[PDB]
Amino acid sequence: ATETTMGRYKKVIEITGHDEVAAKLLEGLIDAGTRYFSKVVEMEHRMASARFRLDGEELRELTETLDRSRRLAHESLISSLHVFNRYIVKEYGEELKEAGIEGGIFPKPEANRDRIAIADWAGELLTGIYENRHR
């Protein structure tokens, strides 16, 4: 189970979920994830479409506002992740290692500083949760 994004996420909940601080920090991480997802989609959609009706300067201004806001959201995602994993490793590091998910919720050792891999990871987690939504 724990090999997958979804498996590691569910193990993190099982291991750390009784700690109220860990719980709140993880709620915050998922929220930072949906925020970044939302800003990316909002932007990408507007970049696809705004060209069919905005002049160059209007488009330039819009592009910059969306761009800066998306980047900030990405930095917040990254910070939320790092802060959460540092906490759970500090407090449950042994349990995590025993469960096969040493280092926490992120599947990488190598790429946990990688802006695009963190964005890829967030997409996978959020997609999996959405697709597994209960009937």
Name the residue among 101, 81, 98 with its Cα closest to residue 1.
101
Name the residue among 127, 124, 110 with its Cα closest to residue 4.
124
User: What is the CA 9 to chain-centroid distance, rounded?
Assistant: 12
Phi, psi of 55 (to 5 degrees): -70, 180
| Binding flag, residue 33, its own copies (CB under 8 A) | yes
Specify whether the CB–CB gap between 118 and 26 falls below 8 A: no
Tokens, residue 50? 């705004």
Residue closer to Cl ion, measured from CB, 47 or 111:
111
Residue closer to its own copies, measured from CB, 43 or 101:
43
Residue closer to Cl ion, measured from CB, 62 or 111:
111
For residue 58, the minimal CB distance to its own copies (Å) is 12
Residues 40-79 that bind its own copies (CB under 8 A): 40-53, 63
| Binding flag, residue 113, its own copies (CB under 8 A) | no
Residue closer to its own copies, measured from CB, 74 or 107:
74
| Binding flag, residue 1, its own copies (CB under 8 A) | no
Residues 24-83 that bind Cl ion (CB under 5 A): none
Binding-residue pattern over the window 92 to 121 for Cl ion, x denoting contact by CB under 5 A: ----------xx----x-------------
Angle of CA points 12, 122, 33, to nearest 5°: 90
For residue 109, the minimal CB distance to Cl ion (Å) is 6
Tokens, residue 56? 């160059």
